[PDB]
Amino acid sequence: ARVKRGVIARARHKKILKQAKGYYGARSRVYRVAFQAVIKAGQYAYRDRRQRKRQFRQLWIARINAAARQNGISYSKFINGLKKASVEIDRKILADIAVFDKVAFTALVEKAKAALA
Amino acid sequence: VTGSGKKPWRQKGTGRARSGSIKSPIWRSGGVTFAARPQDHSQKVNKKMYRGALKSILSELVRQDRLIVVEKFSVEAPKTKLLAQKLKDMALEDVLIITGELDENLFLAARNLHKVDVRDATGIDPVSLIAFDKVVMTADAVKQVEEMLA
Amino acid sequence: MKTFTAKPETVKRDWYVVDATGKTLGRLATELARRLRGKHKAEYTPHVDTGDYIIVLNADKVAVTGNKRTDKVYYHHTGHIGGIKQATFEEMIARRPERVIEIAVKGMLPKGPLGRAMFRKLKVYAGNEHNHAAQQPQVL
Amino acid sequence: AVQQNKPTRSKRGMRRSHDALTAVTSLSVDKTSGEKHLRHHITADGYYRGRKVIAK
Amino acid sequence: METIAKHRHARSSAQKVRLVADLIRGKKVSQALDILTYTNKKAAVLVKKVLESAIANAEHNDGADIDDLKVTKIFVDEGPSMKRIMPRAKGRADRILKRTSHITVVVSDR
RNA sequence: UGUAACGGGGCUAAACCAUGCACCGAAGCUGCGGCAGCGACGCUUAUGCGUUGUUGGGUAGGGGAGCGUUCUGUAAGCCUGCGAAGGUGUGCUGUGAGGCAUGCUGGAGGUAUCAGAAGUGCGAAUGCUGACAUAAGUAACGAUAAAGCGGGUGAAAAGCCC
RNA sequence: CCCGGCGAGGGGAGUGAAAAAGAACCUGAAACCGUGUACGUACAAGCAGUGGGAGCACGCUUAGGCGUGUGACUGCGUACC
């Protein structure tokens, strides 16, 4: 029954964890972090692996607007014309080939232009 | 303990204190904190816990165990080393050297290596029924009705 | 496998004479940010670490189009909250290329973070074709 | 007032730049081969050649 | 490695011994007295008789060259533990420390 | 007491109101994983696995379930001076106390069975027994009021001594 | 045996399994420290982050995006009870 406070006490704190720095003296390397505050290290990603994505969305669509602007084919205002066709939905990521494909991608907007434009 | 109570002094005049009682069961030189009471308690058993199908293990095992043979006289005893040769009718050689009979004979020499306290005479002591290979009850029909404890 | 593009340091700089100076100034000083970052050059890293090289030509032409021009102040009080104040206005200060009436990007990268290394890459030499002190190789 | 904030860590223990020293040179000169100092000719009797102060 | 003649035991804190130890490393040893014996603090005097009695061994005691034993480190530890009292407050401040000093010299060569 | 009422920068229409349209889009229902509770089904039934319904933040209360530094016991029983083992950081493993191993090591030791419940699972008792990482080069350094050399000597003299 | 202050401590011998048993006699981490392999770096913001990743002291690979940590850019925030 004698306890002597041990076994599991240095265990719940580091062991194998591939984290060498940690919060310095009176926040951590003394003792103080080990039980109630070592959970914090995921909590900046515990909701956001969703919410972060909004930042980078302008990358992939860049390749269908930067030159297409001077042709008037404006992202938000092209998209109503396009979506009139029920097989043409998933333009989101699948249009990104436009970054190298330019010299024969120039044709793509001919397909329905008579009525589209 | 001998230690100076009860309290010695008035703890003020530092703007830092909390304790000073000395004993108090907590701090140094002592002791057992829990009332210092002698926990002497006979944890009592009831009469028909013995009668009481407790004896019924020999129908659980039935193939290796109670080893029904002959009563105890066969032992030497001044060379008890020899009884390994004679313990072959039960086959057992040395495993758990009991016989669980009814009378005063030379067979107490059995416990020379530890084994168990032997007991023998009528009360077979229930902590000898759980959980050994050789529950030997070996003597005759002296089991009729309340006699089954024996 | 990654969709990301760091450093990039700086891979797309688009060396351009920003002639829009005065004649549609308050339309494109608002979006010199989105140019350094984007709208053409958006194809790599349109939020993080990057650099640009836009070419300055004039400064004292702010145009600005409202009553704001002859009664909006600017304040720095650079030492001990100033005490004794200042009260010059927008078409009177713009006479001097200073730090608040001419860069625009001051107000759009508005604290210093991400802005902390890209102060004078646009040179801010001002004085038309007599003052083309910019890049010798061929700017657009 | 009593000690009531951070230890001598990093920005306190660092402080060494003006605690500094002179990395001075020294003259070999076999006219006084080991009782000598960096130019000062003998640390005790005040020598050069003959009978100076209390030398020879 | 070659020699490690640390001395004991001082009256100062390990800080006072710490301030001159760093100069001597790897491009000086041929004339290792001057710098210390011109900087005559009770500090540098210790480190001065640490060095002599070390390298005067190494040239007789291995058989190496007095000139090339470069002096590759010089580090410092305290201890174990020494106390006294000076009754300023006579139950509070009152107990003055003596941290000691010994200089793990660690010589080796060019 | 630094212009400081959207957070800015005020935008002459980019707006302000009405009418069209598709992008952004909290943890908010969707992709499709795993599944504790109280219910209904196909059957099974010592009972359980999936289907189907209600649905999965948890200090007042009542349910009802995992494990240990080792003591008292599983066991002259098998294990180890061919290492039985920590501080440690090989490799994956549980829904978890944490391990079955292990990696580099130590130099005597164990419970993968279940019987056992109480010196009973610690960092906050304004800490305590003995401490000191700490307050810097931490006295007014012992009032500020005294000193001048030539020496004799020596393991080293502001002092010893002439 | 060898140096130094007719000293302290070590560098090899050595009774010795051992001096990581050496008489500040415990086979043995803890508060705090010194020289260093490389980092970040004398325009600092906001519990000093886990992300997302350039290439760097070093290491394995018939080339195969990994085994390694201070942590350029900045994103997310307020860890307590």
From Swiss-Prot, chain A:
The cross-references to Pfam families, in alphabetical order and at most eight, read: Ribosomal_L20
Q: Which PROSITE patterns match?
A: RIBOSOMAL_L20
Q: Which domain of life is it from?
A: Bacteria
- Any one biological process term the GO annotation gives: cytoplasmic translation
Q: What InterPro entries would the database entry show? A: Ribosomal_bL20, RIBOSOMAL_L20_CS, Ribosomal_protein_bL20_C
CDD domains named in the record: Ribosomal_L20
Mention one GO molecular function.
mRNA binding
- Keywords in alphabetical order, please: Ribonucleoprotein, Ribosomal protein, RNA-binding, rRNA-binding
Instruction: Give an example GO cellular component term for this record.
Output: cytosolic large ribosomal subunit
What's this protein's function? One of the primary rRNA binding proteins, it binds close to the 5'-end of the 23S rRNA. It is important during the early stages of 50S assembly.
Protein family according to the UniProt entry? Belongs to the bacterial ribosomal protein bL20 family.
Provide the assembly information.
Part of the 50S ribosomal subunit. Contacts L21.
Q: What is this protein called?
A: Large ribosomal subunit protein bL20
Q: Which organism is it from?
A: Escherichia coli (strain K12)
From Swiss-Prot, chain B:
GO MF terms here are: DNA binding; endoribonuclease inhibitor activity; mRNA 5'-UTR binding; RNA-binding transcription regulator activity; rRNA binding; structural constituent of ribosome; translation repressor activity
User: Consequence of mutating A109V?
Assistant: Does not regulate the S10 operon; assembles into ribosomes in vivo
Q: Which GO terms describe its biological process?
A: cytoplasmic translation; DNA-templated transcription termination; negative regulation of cytoplasmic translation; negative regulation of DNA-templated transcription; negative regulation of translation; response to antibiotic; ribosome assembly; transcriptional attenuation
Origin, by domain of life?
A: Bacteria
What is a single cellular component term in the Gene Ontology annotation?
Answer: large ribosomal subunit
Keyword Membrane belongs to the record: no
Q: Where is this region: Disordered?
A: 1-20
Keywords assigned by UniProt, alphabetized:
Antibiotic resistance, Repressor, Ribonucleoprotein, Ribosomal protein, RNA-binding, rRNA-binding, Transcription, Transcription regulation, Transcription termination, Translation regulation
Keyword Cell membrane set for record:
no
Q: What miscellaneous comment appears in this entry?
A: The erythromycin sensitive allele is dominant over the resistant allele.
**Role, per record:** One of the primary rRNA binding proteins, this protein initially binds near the 5'-end of the 23S rRNA. It is important during the early stages of 50S assembly. It makes multiple contacts with different domains of the 23S rRNA in the assembled 50S subunit and ribosome.
Subunit structure comment from the entry: Part of the 50S ribosomal subunit. In TnaC-stalled ribosomes forms part of the binding pocket for L-Trp with the leader peptide and uL22.
What's the name of its gene? rplD
Swiss-Prot record, chain C:
**Per its record, how is this protein called by name?**
Large ribosomal subunit protein uL13
GO CC entries: cytoplasm; cytosol; cytosolic large ribosomal subunit; ribosome
Subunit: Part of the 50S ribosomal subunit.
Arranged from A to Z, the UniProt key words for this protein are: Ribonucleoprotein, Ribosomal protein
Which source organism does the UniProt entry give? Escherichia coli (strain K12)
Membership in a protein family? Belongs to the universal ribosomal protein uL13 family.
Which GO BP terms, alphabetically?
Answer: cytoplasmic translation; negative regulation of translation
Question: Can you tell me which residues the record assigns to a coiled coil?
Answer: none
From Swiss-Prot, chain E:
Q: Fill in the subunit field for this protein.
A: Part of the 50S ribosomal subunit. In TnaC-stalled ribosomes forms part of the binding pocket for L-Trp with the leader peptide and uL4.
User: Which purpose does this protein serve, as stated in its record?
Assistant: This protein binds specifically to 23S rRNA; its binding is stimulated by other ribosomal proteins, e.g. uL4, bL17, and bL20. It is important during the early stages of 50S assembly. It makes multiple contacts with different domains of the 23S rRNA in the assembled 50S subunit and ribosome.
Which named protein is this? Large ribosomal subunit protein uL22
* Source species, domain of life: Bacteria
Q: Which InterPro entries match?
A: Ribosomal_uL22, Ribosomal_uL22_bac/chlpt-type, Ribosomal_uL22_bac/org-type, Ribosomal_uL22_CS, Ribosomal_uL22_sf
What is the scientific name of the source organism? Answer: Escherichia coli (strain K12)
Q: Which family does it belong to?
A: Belongs to the universal ribosomal protein uL22 family.
GO molecular function terms attached to this record: large ribosomal subunit rRNA binding; structural constituent of ribosome
This protein's encoding gene: rplV
Query: Per the record, what is the consequence of mutating R8C?
Result: In strain: SK1048; decreases translational rate, tRNA binding and subunit association at 44 degrees Celsius; does not alter 23S rRNA or uL4 interactions; not erythromycin resistant
Other comment: The wild-type allele (erythromycin sensitive) is dominant over the resistant allele, and is also dominant over the temperature-sensitive allele at both low and high temperatures.
Q: What is the effect of changing A93 to S/T/V?
A: Abolishes translation elongation arrest of SecM
What's one GO-annotated cellular component?
cytoplasm
The residues that hold L-tryptophan are: K90
Question: Mind listing the UniProt keywords for this protein, alphabetically?
Answer: Antibiotic resistance, Ribonucleoprotein, Ribosomal protein, RNA-binding, rRNA-binding
Acetylation: is it a keyword of this entry? no
